[PDB]
Design a protein around this ligand. Structure first.
Ligand SMILES: O[C@@H]1[C@@H](O)[C@H](O[C@@H]2CO[C@@H](O[C@@H]3CO[C@H](O)[C@H](O)[C@H]3O)[C@H](O)[C@H]2O)OC[C@H]1O
Length: 392
């Protein structure tokens, strides 16, 4: 039997590590082989949605739990997994790992990773100019102005694919409004046309106007921006913890041991708790409802998920969802540990990035309207009117 598996781990060392994880399975399972097809993140979203709709999805596929996957589950395209989870598997994952892969009270995925929002600081550049790490949004705007004045790009941001810049908006909205107001809006219990979301839009444009980003940032991908930051060409980078690898594990990086992870700053008058973050347990593997080899495919998905989780922890491409007592802490990068310590530990609450929590057209609307904010092609007030009108 040969199972197909799709994932998005395109960069090094993840691409090599995933291949190794698959090679090990294949050596230990002569009669159940896996073959993988690997597609860059943003093209993978297109690929997996089309495949699921056309009933040509692989046996096992990587996904984002929550809103992203909800249509696949509602269409009957995803194998329910409850009957395969009475074997002790649950106790091998961290508490609460399954919540986002549970729909209508039933489990449709095997979690493997958690996301968390991280402000990354180039300590070398901060020390060079004697800039303190900013802890408030006022301090952050002052730091942006200080770096800009020295000819140093304050933030490396690649906004072409829209979701990386959206992280900035969703965090600022979380600091302005708090987690409950974000959830209510995303769940349709509050209009998007609310002063906290408009204030967030203004603060995002305050970053642009202060010269936080390089002139051509709308033209750059995430990968191009992580290359900018790992070459030491920007003071700060903000986004997912998954980007950490580009800085401490990518062999091209010039900033290993120079990068610190901190929480996004507080905003004066904001209603959000300073420890709230954008993220949650949202990396999962799912099995296709139409797989010819359901039992083998779930066995393989259990194995893949644990190995991806351990890999994520070791190379800092993600925060593990599986317990990691088998892993030796001295082999883990200090930045990954720091993400756990500075962002995740003792956090009051969290919410996934809005394009994983929303689905389809609504997620796309938010990504495109945020991209207009960055481009100064919309006012904060019209942003919030249009969000309400286009979504609801
Ligand atoms: O829509 C956004 C998603 O696209 C985003 O997904 C993460 C993209 O980054 C992946 O990280 C990989 C780690 O290492 C490799 O070398 C790859 O090239 C990277 O793509 C994460 O695994 C995905 O979770 O999540 C947030 C969402 O807003």
């Amino acid at each position: 039997i040969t199972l197909t598996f799709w994932n998005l781990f395109t960069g090094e060392p993840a691409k090599t590590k995933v291949k190794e994880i698959i090679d090990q399975w294949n050596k230990e399972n002569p009669n159940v082989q896996i073959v993988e097809s690997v597609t860059e993140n943003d093209a993978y979203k297109t690929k997996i949605k089309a495949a699921i709709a056309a009933n040509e999805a692989p046996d096992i596929f990587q996904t984002w739990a929550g809103g992203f996957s909800q249509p696949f589950v509602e269409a009957g395209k995803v194998l329910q997994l409850d009957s395969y989870l009475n074997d002790g598997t649950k106790d091998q994952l961290l508490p609460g790992s399954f919540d986002n892969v549970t729909y209508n009270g039933k489990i449709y995925g095997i979690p493997f990773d958690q996301q968390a929002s991280v402000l990354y600081i180039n300590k070398e550049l901060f020390d060079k100019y004697n800039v303190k790490v900013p802890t408030t949004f006022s301090e952050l705007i002052d730091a942006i102005k200080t770096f800009k004045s020295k000819g140093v790009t304050p933030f490396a941001l690649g906004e072409k694919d829209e979701w990386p810049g959206m992280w900035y908006y969703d965090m600022i909205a979380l600091r302005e409004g708090g987690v409950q107001l974000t959830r209510d809006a995303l769940n349709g219990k509050a209009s998007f046309d609310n002063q906290a979301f408009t204030d967030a839009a203004q603060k995002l444009q305050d970053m642009v106007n202060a010269g936080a980003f390089d002139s051509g940032f709308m033209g750059l991908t995430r990968d191009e921006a992580t290359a900018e930051f790992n070459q030491g060409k920007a003071a700060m980078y903000f986004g997912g913890n998954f980007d950490a690898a580009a800085f401490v594990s990518d062999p091209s990086s010039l900033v290993k041991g120079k990068i610190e992870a901190v929480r996004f700053p507080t905003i004066e008058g904001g209603k959000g708790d300073p420890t709230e973050y954008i993220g949650g347990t949202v990396g999962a593997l799912m099995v296709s409802a139409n797989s010819k080899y359901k039992d083998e495919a779930v066995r393989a998905a259990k194995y893949l998920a644990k190995q991806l989780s351990d890999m994520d922890y070791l190379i800092a491409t993600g925060l593990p969802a599986w317990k990691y007592d088998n892993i030796d802490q001295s082999k883990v990068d200090p930045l990954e540990i720091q993400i756990m310590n500075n962002i995740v530990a003792n956090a009051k609450g969290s919410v996934p990035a809005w394009d994983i929590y929303l689905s389809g057209d609504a997620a796309q609307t938010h990504k495109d309207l945020v991209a207009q904010l960055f481009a100064k092609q919309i006012t904060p007030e019209e942003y919030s009117k249009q969000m309400q009108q286009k979504i609801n």
